[PDB]
Design a protein around this ligand. Structure first.
Ligand code: 1FZ
Ligand code: MG
Ligand code: MG
Ligand code: NA
Ligand code: NA
Length: 324
DNA sequence: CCGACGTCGCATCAGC
DNA sequence: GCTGATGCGA
DNA sequence: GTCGG
Protein backbone atom coordinates (compact mmCIF):
# COMPACT_ATOMS: atom_id res chain seq x y z
CA UNK A 1 0.00 0.00 0.00
CA UNK A 2 1.80 3.08 1.31
CA UNK A 3 4.77 0.90 2.28
CA UNK A 4 7.41 3.43 1.22
CA UNK A 5 5.13 6.46 1.05
CA UNK A 6 7.60 8.92 2.53
CA UNK A 7 10.13 7.92 -0.11
CA UNK A 8 7.74 7.99 -3.09
CA UNK A 9 6.14 11.27 -1.94
CA UNK A 10 9.65 12.73 -1.75
CA UNK A 11 10.57 11.51 -5.24
CA UNK A 12 7.30 12.84 -6.68
CA UNK A 13 7.87 16.27 -5.13
CA UNK A 14 11.39 16.22 -6.58
CA UNK A 15 9.95 15.25 -9.97
CA UNK A 16 7.59 18.21 -10.11
CA UNK A 17 10.26 20.80 -9.34
CA UNK A 18 12.45 19.33 -12.09
CA UNK A 19 9.63 19.69 -14.65
CA UNK A 20 7.97 22.88 -13.43
CA UNK A 21 10.90 24.92 -12.07
CA UNK A 22 14.13 23.49 -13.49
CA UNK A 23 12.39 22.68 -16.79
CA UNK A 24 14.28 19.39 -16.99
CA UNK A 25 11.70 16.98 -18.35
CA UNK A 26 13.99 13.95 -18.43
CA UNK A 27 14.87 14.33 -14.75
CA UNK A 28 11.14 14.60 -14.12
CA UNK A 29 10.53 11.23 -15.74
CA UNK A 30 13.61 9.76 -14.00
CA UNK A 31 12.22 10.62 -10.57
CA UNK A 32 8.73 9.35 -11.42
CA UNK A 33 10.12 6.10 -12.82
CA UNK A 34 12.09 5.68 -9.60
CA UNK A 35 9.02 6.46 -7.50
CA UNK A 36 7.00 4.00 -9.56
CA UNK A 37 9.30 0.99 -9.13
CA UNK A 38 9.56 1.74 -5.40
CA UNK A 39 5.78 2.03 -5.04
CA UNK A 40 5.41 -1.57 -6.25
CA UNK A 41 8.29 -2.89 -4.12
CA UNK A 42 6.72 -5.09 -1.39
CA UNK A 43 9.15 -4.31 1.46
CA UNK A 44 9.81 -1.33 3.72
CA UNK A 45 13.16 -0.13 2.36
CA UNK A 46 16.03 -0.10 4.88
CA UNK A 47 18.75 1.62 2.86
CA UNK A 48 19.54 3.46 -0.36
CA UNK A 49 21.64 0.45 -1.32
CA UNK A 50 18.64 -1.86 -1.09
CA UNK A 51 16.66 0.50 -3.32
CA UNK A 52 19.42 0.88 -5.92
CA UNK A 53 18.87 -2.71 -7.11
CA UNK A 54 15.59 -1.59 -8.67
CA UNK A 55 15.66 -0.48 -12.33
CA UNK A 56 15.50 3.31 -12.32
CA UNK A 57 17.09 3.92 -8.93
CA UNK A 58 20.70 5.09 -9.21
CA UNK A 59 23.46 6.51 -7.02
CA UNK A 60 21.89 9.95 -6.44
CA UNK A 61 18.44 8.69 -5.44
CA UNK A 62 19.99 5.90 -3.32
CA UNK A 63 21.85 8.70 -1.53
CA UNK A 64 18.70 10.78 -1.06
CA UNK A 65 16.92 7.76 0.41
CA UNK A 66 19.75 7.33 2.93
CA UNK A 67 19.32 10.96 4.00
CA UNK A 68 15.53 10.56 4.24
CA UNK A 69 15.77 7.41 6.36
CA UNK A 70 18.27 9.02 8.72
CA UNK A 71 16.70 12.45 9.12
CA UNK A 72 13.10 12.12 7.94
CA UNK A 73 13.69 14.74 5.25
CA UNK A 74 15.85 16.12 2.43
CA UNK A 75 17.76 19.37 3.02
CA UNK A 76 17.43 20.32 -0.66
CA UNK A 77 13.69 19.60 -0.77
CA UNK A 78 13.04 21.52 2.46
CA UNK A 79 14.98 24.47 1.05
CA UNK A 80 13.08 24.66 -2.24
CA UNK A 81 9.74 24.18 -0.45
CA UNK A 82 10.50 27.39 1.42
CA UNK A 83 11.62 29.31 -1.70
CA UNK A 84 8.82 31.77 -2.56
CA UNK A 85 9.63 32.02 -6.26
CA UNK A 86 10.18 28.30 -6.89
CA UNK A 87 7.21 27.05 -4.88
CA UNK A 88 4.98 29.60 -6.60
CA UNK A 89 6.16 28.56 -10.05
CA UNK A 90 5.57 24.91 -9.18
CA UNK A 91 2.09 25.67 -7.84
CA UNK A 92 0.80 27.79 -10.72
CA UNK A 93 1.50 24.91 -13.14
CA UNK A 94 -1.40 23.08 -11.46
CA UNK A 95 -3.65 25.32 -13.56
CA UNK A 96 -4.47 23.67 -16.88
CA UNK A 97 -2.90 25.68 -19.68
CA UNK A 98 -0.19 27.08 -17.42
CA UNK A 99 2.99 25.17 -18.11
CA UNK A 100 6.52 25.76 -16.74
CA UNK A 101 7.13 28.71 -19.08
CA UNK A 102 3.87 30.55 -18.38
CA UNK A 103 4.22 29.93 -14.66
CA UNK A 104 7.74 31.36 -14.80
CA UNK A 105 6.68 34.57 -16.56
CA UNK A 106 3.79 35.02 -14.14
CA UNK A 107 5.95 34.71 -11.02
CA UNK A 108 8.49 37.06 -12.65
CA UNK A 109 5.94 39.88 -12.76
CA UNK A 110 4.61 39.20 -9.26
CA UNK A 111 1.69 36.93 -10.19
CA UNK A 112 1.94 34.03 -7.74
CA UNK A 113 -1.49 32.89 -6.50
CA UNK A 114 -4.90 31.92 -7.87
CA UNK A 115 -6.09 35.30 -6.61
CA UNK A 116 -3.38 37.08 -8.59
CA UNK A 117 -4.53 35.15 -11.66
CA UNK A 118 -8.14 36.12 -10.90
CA UNK A 119 -7.38 39.84 -11.04
CA UNK A 120 -5.26 39.48 -14.19
CA UNK A 121 -7.67 37.91 -16.70
CA UNK A 122 -6.40 39.75 -19.79
CA UNK A 123 -2.97 38.14 -19.37
CA UNK A 124 -4.63 34.72 -19.65
CA UNK A 125 -5.29 32.90 -22.92
CA UNK A 126 -8.57 31.02 -23.45
CA UNK A 127 -7.33 27.66 -22.11
CA UNK A 128 -5.80 29.25 -19.02
CA UNK A 129 -9.04 31.04 -18.09
CA UNK A 130 -10.90 27.72 -18.22
CA UNK A 131 -8.15 26.03 -16.20
CA UNK A 132 -8.49 28.75 -13.58
CA UNK A 133 -12.30 28.66 -13.48
CA UNK A 134 -12.34 24.91 -12.87
CA UNK A 135 -9.12 24.65 -10.86
CA UNK A 136 -10.79 22.71 -8.07
CA UNK A 137 -13.03 20.57 -10.27
CA UNK A 138 -10.14 19.51 -12.54
CA UNK A 139 -8.29 18.04 -9.56
CA UNK A 140 -11.18 15.79 -8.54
CA UNK A 141 -11.54 12.24 -9.77
CA UNK A 142 -14.76 10.95 -11.29
CA UNK A 143 -16.70 8.17 -9.53
CA UNK A 144 -17.41 5.31 -11.96
CA UNK A 145 -21.14 5.83 -11.44
CA UNK A 146 -20.91 9.36 -12.81
CA UNK A 147 -18.81 8.07 -15.70
CA UNK A 148 -21.61 5.65 -16.59
CA UNK A 149 -24.14 8.49 -16.57
CA UNK A 150 -21.68 10.46 -18.69
CA UNK A 151 -21.37 7.49 -21.05
CA UNK A 152 -25.16 7.19 -21.30
CA UNK A 153 -25.37 10.78 -22.52
CA UNK A 154 -22.50 10.55 -25.00
CA UNK A 155 -23.56 7.27 -26.66
CA UNK A 156 -27.16 8.45 -26.89
CA UNK A 157 -26.36 11.84 -28.44
CA UNK A 158 -23.77 10.37 -30.80
CA UNK A 159 -26.22 7.78 -32.15
CA UNK A 160 -28.88 10.51 -32.41
CA UNK A 161 -26.67 12.59 -34.73
CA UNK A 162 -25.91 9.62 -36.97
CA UNK A 163 -26.68 5.99 -36.11
CA UNK A 164 -23.65 4.79 -38.09
CA UNK A 165 -21.17 6.45 -35.74
CA UNK A 166 -19.10 4.16 -33.55
CA UNK A 167 -18.08 5.59 -30.18
CA UNK A 168 -16.15 4.00 -27.32
CA UNK A 169 -15.20 5.35 -23.93
CA UNK A 170 -11.67 4.17 -23.44
CA UNK A 171 -9.06 4.82 -20.79
CA UNK A 172 -9.31 3.76 -17.14
CA UNK A 173 -13.09 3.59 -17.46
CA UNK A 174 -12.97 0.87 -20.10
CA UNK A 175 -10.42 -0.99 -17.97
CA UNK A 176 -13.05 -1.05 -15.23
CA UNK A 177 -11.52 1.35 -12.70
CA UNK A 178 -13.57 2.57 -9.72
CA UNK A 179 -12.93 6.17 -10.72
CA UNK A 180 -11.46 8.26 -13.53
CA UNK A 181 -9.49 11.46 -14.02
CA UNK A 182 -11.17 12.32 -17.31
CA UNK A 183 -13.39 10.92 -20.06
CA UNK A 184 -11.65 9.69 -23.20
CA UNK A 185 -14.07 9.25 -26.09
CA UNK A 186 -12.96 7.62 -29.34
CA UNK A 187 -15.05 8.20 -32.42
CA UNK A 188 -15.26 6.83 -35.95
CA UNK A 189 -17.65 6.63 -38.90
CA UNK A 190 -17.60 4.14 -41.82
CA UNK A 191 -17.13 7.02 -44.28
CA UNK A 192 -13.87 8.02 -42.59
CA UNK A 193 -10.69 6.20 -43.64
CA UNK A 194 -6.99 7.03 -44.12
CA UNK A 195 -7.48 7.92 -47.79
CA UNK A 196 -10.89 9.54 -47.31
CA UNK A 197 -15.65 15.78 -43.63
CA UNK A 198 -14.42 18.25 -40.96
CA UNK A 199 -18.01 18.04 -39.82
CA UNK A 200 -17.94 14.47 -38.49
CA UNK A 201 -16.40 15.72 -35.24
CA UNK A 202 -18.03 19.18 -35.23
CA UNK A 203 -21.57 17.79 -35.51
CA UNK A 204 -21.02 15.53 -32.50
CA UNK A 205 -19.56 18.32 -30.36
CA UNK A 206 -22.40 20.65 -31.38
CA UNK A 207 -25.11 18.19 -30.30
CA UNK A 208 -23.47 17.64 -26.90
CA UNK A 209 -23.46 21.43 -26.60
CA UNK A 210 -27.13 21.68 -27.58
CA UNK A 211 -28.22 19.38 -24.75
CA UNK A 212 -25.83 21.31 -22.50
CA UNK A 213 -23.54 18.38 -21.69
CA UNK A 214 -20.41 20.03 -23.10
CA UNK A 215 -19.98 23.40 -21.37
CA UNK A 216 -16.58 24.75 -22.52
CA UNK A 217 -13.94 24.21 -25.23
CA UNK A 218 -10.15 24.08 -24.71
CA UNK A 219 -9.36 23.07 -28.28
CA UNK A 220 -11.22 21.80 -31.34
CA UNK A 221 -9.66 20.78 -34.63
CA UNK A 222 -10.90 18.51 -37.42
CA UNK A 223 -9.91 15.36 -35.53
CA UNK A 224 -9.49 16.13 -31.82
CA UNK A 225 -11.73 17.89 -29.31
CA UNK A 226 -10.64 18.86 -25.81
CA UNK A 227 -13.24 20.35 -23.52
CA UNK A 228 -15.33 20.50 -20.38
CA UNK A 229 -18.63 18.81 -19.53
CA UNK A 230 -21.08 18.38 -16.65
CA UNK A 231 -23.94 16.04 -15.70
CA UNK A 232 -27.32 17.76 -15.20
CA UNK A 233 -28.21 18.91 -11.68
CA UNK A 234 -30.01 15.96 -10.07
CA UNK A 235 -32.80 20.47 -6.11
CA UNK A 236 -29.38 18.89 -5.55
CA UNK A 237 -25.73 19.93 -5.35
CA UNK A 238 -24.43 20.29 -8.89
CA UNK A 239 -21.83 17.87 -10.22
CA UNK A 240 -18.26 19.12 -10.75
CA UNK A 241 -17.22 20.11 -14.27
CA UNK A 242 -15.17 17.37 -15.97
CA UNK A 243 -12.52 17.03 -18.66
CA UNK A 244 -13.66 15.25 -21.81
CA UNK A 245 -11.68 14.50 -24.96
CA UNK A 246 -13.25 13.35 -28.20
CA UNK A 247 -11.08 11.78 -30.88
CA UNK A 248 -12.19 11.23 -34.47
CA UNK A 249 -10.16 8.33 -35.92
CA UNK A 250 -10.25 6.67 -39.37
CA UNK A 251 -12.14 3.35 -39.39
CA UNK A 252 -9.05 1.38 -40.44
CA UNK A 253 -7.08 2.88 -37.54
CA UNK A 254 -9.88 2.86 -34.98
CA UNK A 255 -9.14 -0.34 -33.11
CA UNK A 256 -5.42 0.33 -32.81
CA UNK A 257 -6.59 3.62 -31.34
CA UNK A 258 -9.03 1.92 -28.97
CA UNK A 259 -6.37 -0.57 -27.80
CA UNK A 260 -3.84 2.24 -27.37
CA UNK A 261 -6.07 4.71 -25.54
CA UNK A 262 -7.43 1.97 -23.29
CA UNK A 263 -3.98 1.23 -21.91
CA UNK A 264 -2.56 1.01 -19.48
CA UNK A 265 0.78 2.66 -20.31
CA UNK A 266 2.78 -0.22 -18.91
CA UNK A 267 0.47 -2.91 -20.25
CA UNK A 268 0.63 -1.60 -23.78
CA UNK A 269 4.44 -1.46 -24.28
CA UNK A 270 4.79 -4.94 -22.77
CA UNK A 271 2.38 -5.66 -25.58
CA UNK A 272 4.50 -3.57 -28.01
CA UNK A 273 7.73 -5.17 -26.79
CA UNK A 274 6.28 -8.64 -27.24
CA UNK A 275 4.87 -7.56 -30.61
CA UNK A 276 8.25 -6.76 -32.13
CA UNK A 277 9.73 -9.88 -30.52
CA UNK A 278 7.81 -11.41 -33.39
CA UNK A 279 8.47 -8.93 -36.21
CA UNK A 280 5.43 -6.69 -35.77
CA UNK A 281 5.57 -3.03 -34.78
CA UNK A 282 2.56 -1.58 -32.97
CA UNK A 283 1.89 2.14 -32.71
CA UNK A 284 -1.15 4.34 -32.06
CA UNK A 285 -2.50 3.97 -35.59
CA UNK A 286 -1.33 0.71 -37.13
CA UNK A 287 0.39 -2.65 -36.84
CA UNK A 288 3.09 -3.51 -39.35
CA UNK A 289 5.30 -6.59 -40.13
CA UNK A 290 9.10 -6.14 -40.03
CA UNK A 291 11.29 -7.63 -42.73
CA UNK A 292 14.49 -9.52 -42.10
CA UNK A 293 15.95 -6.18 -43.10
CA UNK A 294 14.15 -4.23 -40.42
CA UNK A 295 12.15 -2.35 -43.00
CA UNK A 296 8.50 -2.02 -42.03
CA UNK A 297 5.95 -3.56 -44.36
CA UNK A 298 2.68 -1.89 -45.28
CA UNK A 299 0.13 -1.68 -42.44
CA UNK A 300 -2.19 -4.67 -41.93
CA UNK A 301 -6.02 -4.63 -41.75
CA UNK A 302 -7.54 -4.48 -38.25
CA UNK A 303 -11.28 -4.90 -37.62
CA UNK A 304 -11.54 -5.70 -33.91
CA UNK A 305 -9.28 -5.39 -30.91
CA UNK A 306 -8.82 -9.16 -30.95
CA UNK A 307 -7.47 -8.92 -34.51
CA UNK A 308 -4.21 -7.33 -33.35
CA UNK A 309 -3.85 -10.03 -30.71
CA UNK A 310 -4.11 -12.69 -33.43
CA UNK A 311 -1.53 -11.01 -35.67
CA UNK A 312 0.88 -11.37 -32.79
CA UNK A 313 0.62 -14.63 -30.70
CA UNK A 314 -1.57 -13.35 -27.91
CA UNK A 315 -4.98 -14.49 -26.61
CA UNK A 316 -7.30 -11.55 -26.33
CA UNK A 317 -7.39 -9.94 -22.94
CA UNK A 318 -10.24 -8.19 -21.20
CA UNK A 319 -9.79 -4.47 -20.51
CA UNK A 320 -10.45 -5.45 -16.87
CA UNK A 321 -6.99 -7.01 -16.60
CA UNK A 322 -4.71 -4.50 -18.35
CA UNK A 323 -2.75 -2.88 -15.53
CA UNK A 324 0.34 -4.65 -16.84
C1' DC B 1 31.85 9.02 -22.23
C1' DC B 2 27.84 10.91 -23.64
C1' DG B 3 23.26 10.74 -26.29
C1' DA B 4 18.48 9.01 -25.49
C1' DC B 5 14.92 9.67 -22.65
C1' DG B 6 7.52 9.30 -26.79
C1' DT B 7 4.77 11.49 -29.49
C1' DC B 8 1.56 14.69 -31.78
C1' DG B 9 -2.96 17.91 -32.39
C1' DC B 10 -4.13 22.31 -31.53
C1' DA B 11 -3.44 27.27 -30.07
C1' DT B 12 -0.50 30.78 -30.38
C1' DC B 13 3.79 33.08 -31.04
C1' DA B 14 7.95 34.74 -33.76
C1' DG B 15 9.98 35.67 -38.03
C1' DC B 16 9.57 37.19 -42.59
C1' DG C 1 -0.58 37.44 -44.53
C1' DC C 2 2.09 32.90 -44.64
C1' DT C 3 5.23 29.42 -42.62
C1' DG C 4 7.66 27.38 -39.14
C1' DA C 5 8.58 27.29 -34.10
C1' DT C 6 7.12 26.89 -29.46
C1' DG C 7 4.12 25.77 -25.30
C1' DC C 8 0.94 22.67 -23.68
C1' DG C 9 -1.66 18.47 -22.44
C1' DA C 10 -2.06 13.63 -22.13
C1' DG D 1 18.92 11.23 -13.02
C1' DT D 2 19.48 6.75 -14.98
C1' DC D 3 20.69 3.73 -18.38
C1' DG D 4 23.47 1.60 -21.92
C1' DG D 5 25.92 1.39 -26.40
C1 1FZ E 1 -2.29 10.15 -24.08
C2 1FZ E 1 -1.68 8.88 -24.04
C3 1FZ E 1 -2.41 7.79 -23.54
N1 1FZ E 1 -1.85 6.49 -23.44
C4 1FZ E 1 -2.71 5.39 -22.93
C5 1FZ E 1 -2.54 4.98 -21.47
C6 1FZ E 1 -3.81 5.43 -20.75
O1 1FZ E 1 -4.31 4.36 -19.86
C7 1FZ E 1 -4.79 5.70 -21.90
C8 1FZ E 1 -5.60 6.99 -21.70
O2 1FZ E 1 -4.77 8.06 -21.28
P1 1FZ E 1 -5.13 8.86 -19.98
O3 1FZ E 1 -6.52 9.49 -19.97
O4 1FZ E 1 -3.94 9.89 -20.10
N2 1FZ E 1 -4.86 7.98 -18.55
P2 1FZ E 1 -6.18 7.00 -18.13
O5 1FZ E 1 -7.41 7.26 -18.91
O6 1FZ E 1 -5.70 5.50 -18.34
O7 1FZ E 1 -6.48 7.18 -16.58
P3 1FZ E 1 -7.34 8.39 -16.04
O8 1FZ E 1 -8.49 7.97 -15.19
O9 1FZ E 1 -7.71 9.38 -17.34
O10 1FZ E 1 -6.45 9.28 -15.13
O11 1FZ E 1 -4.01 5.98 -23.08
C9 1FZ E 1 -0.58 6.26 -23.88
O12 1FZ E 1 -0.09 5.14 -23.81
N3 1FZ E 1 0.19 7.34 -24.41
C10 1FZ E 1 -0.36 8.67 -24.49
O13 1FZ E 1 0.32 9.60 -24.94
MG1 MG F 1 -8.21 9.06 -19.13
MG1 MG G 1 -6.87 11.42 -21.09
NA1 NA H 1 20.76 0.67 -10.48
NA1 NA I 1 -0.77 23.40 -15.98
Amino acid sequence: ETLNGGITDMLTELANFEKNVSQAIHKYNAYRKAASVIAKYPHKIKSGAEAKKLPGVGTKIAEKIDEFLATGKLRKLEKIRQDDTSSSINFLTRVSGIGPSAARKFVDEGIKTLEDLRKNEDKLNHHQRIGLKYFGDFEKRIPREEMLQMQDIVLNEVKKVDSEYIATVCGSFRRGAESSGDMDVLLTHPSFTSESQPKLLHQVVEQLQKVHFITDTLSKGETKFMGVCQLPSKDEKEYPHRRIDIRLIPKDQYYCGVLYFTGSDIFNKNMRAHALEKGFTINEYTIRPLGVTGVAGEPLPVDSEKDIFDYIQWKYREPKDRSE
